[PDB]
Write a protein that binds this DNA or RNA. Structure first.
Lengths: 50, 171
RNA sequence: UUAACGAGAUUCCCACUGUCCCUAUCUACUAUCUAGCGAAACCACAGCCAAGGGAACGGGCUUGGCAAAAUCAGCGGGGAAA
RNA sequence: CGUGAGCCCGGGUCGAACGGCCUCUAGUGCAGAUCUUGGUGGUAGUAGCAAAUACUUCAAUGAGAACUUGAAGGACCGAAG
RNA sequence: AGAGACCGAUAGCGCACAAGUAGAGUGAUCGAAAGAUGAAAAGCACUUUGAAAAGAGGGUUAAAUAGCACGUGAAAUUGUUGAAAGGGAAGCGCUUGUGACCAGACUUGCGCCCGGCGGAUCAUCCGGUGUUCUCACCGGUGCACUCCGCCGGGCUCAGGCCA
């Protein structure tokens, strides 16, 4: 029963290991399409980045 | 478990398998195509020579902007490399298939690599940071490998044609 | 025709020198080759030219020149690329 | 088989429901919307992994040791470290 | 509390799930993704190869072509095997050819003339019944030159594809 228990614990980690999370506390959702990179236009005056 | 080559019966053949292996799929494909159809001991010696950089694997399909070497002349190419990690994974799988063949009682020294196939596994999804606060994928492309070792081994004529053949047979 | 002061703008002189005549050489880190790891931008389909293709435009059409696998380092004419 | 949108059958996979006809009904037919969401390529084993002087020998551990540890060396910070 | 010509997990409420959660923002606020092994865990004993993950045998199950990546398992895209093409694009239309792979059609039917079998649901008459009111069925009668099937021949006709 113990061996079955750690086997279940190890099989519970497969999706987060494929997502390459550092443990089960790694639940950060990053900005894949940030607004500052995907909106607005660049003029001759002040720009938002160099 | 189902292998790709279903025509090979398991009575006088051995097989080995590896899944979700974090080794480069392109390098592994080139190494597998290098050792395809070979004797087992010859394949093991070649893979050890690839690890020792004494013999090379030709890069044919996944070869874009790679270096050139004198060791591709054995294969008739110029682009060849030494993918030691793919060689190590394939050596482990080949030794497993050898052990399976010895368990079955087959003659190890007469075995050939009849089937070997590398597929793409689900990708390992890391992230990398770029300039201007951007994040891009930084994935690993792992592979499934499977291999199988095998012992080395006048009807409806016209009446005119019938008469012509009869006359030619008599004459 | 205002002294001092100024990372303000301008002309000249001496000194000085690879700015130049006119380029050469050396060192480090790259680029390069290998092991490991490994993106993105962009992408109708694709990519050799010449003349003609009324609407001053042809890469695909017409007529020619031609035309031989698979590749590596470079390059910045054209296509792409702000 | 039908000009056609489509319809029907055979073979394989599969496991719990479904169809013809006449009426009734509508959130009823996609290639485009720099469409939405999700997934996947070529590019491509490519660009790159080059600021902060620097690493080496033996032994041990271990399946495996440049980036573990002990010793032996060589260096750096140089008291606004 | 009861219902529906409603939706069937990108739909229906944002939420069928430890959802106003996880996460983000100083804050006011913003706000998801995410259902399905199997009837039953029976969730793989044991042996063997590996440092291990796993593999191979061998097992459970109706099925592992259902292995806690789990029903079915499409396309894009990828690997192996088999076939083919390629002198600066391929793809497409008309028509042959080669190779590979196939759907049909056909296999005999009908009608006479003989011979051999096996039976009397041959024509007429009688009675009953039903009907379309003149046509049938049922029971008796037939005594085998009459009817009905079978089996051998012979003959005529019609039969598939290309000429």
């Amino acid at each position: 029963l113990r061996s079955k228990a750690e086997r279940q614990a190890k099989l519970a980690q497969r999706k987060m290991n494929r997502m390459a999370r550092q443990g089960e506390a790694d639940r950060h959702i990053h900005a894949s399409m940030p607004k500052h990179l995907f909106s607005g236009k660049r003029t001759i005056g002040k720009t938002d980045r160099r | 478990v189902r292998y790709a080559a279903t025509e090979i019966a398991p009575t006088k053949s051995a097989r080995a398998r590896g899944s979700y292996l974090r080794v480069s799929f392109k390098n592994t494909r080139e190494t597998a195509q290098a050792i395809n159809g070979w004797k087992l001991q010859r394949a093991l010696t070649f893979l050890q020579n690839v690890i020792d950089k004494k013999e090379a694997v030709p890069m044919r399909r996944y070869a874009g902007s790679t270096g050139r070497t004198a060791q591709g002349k054995q294969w008739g190419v110029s682009r060849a490399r030494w993918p030691v990690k793919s060689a190590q994974f394939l050596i482990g799988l080949l030794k497993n298939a050898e052990a399976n063949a010895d368990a079955k009682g087959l003659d190890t020294g007469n075995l050939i690599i009849k089937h070997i196939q590398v597929n793409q596994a689900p990708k390992q999804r890391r992230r990398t940071y770029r300039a201007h606060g951007r994040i891009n994928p930084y994935m690993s492309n792992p592979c499934h490998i499977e291999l199988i070792l095998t012992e080395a081994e006048e009807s409806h004529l016209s009446s005119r044609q019938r008469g012509v053949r009869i006359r030619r047979a008599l004459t």
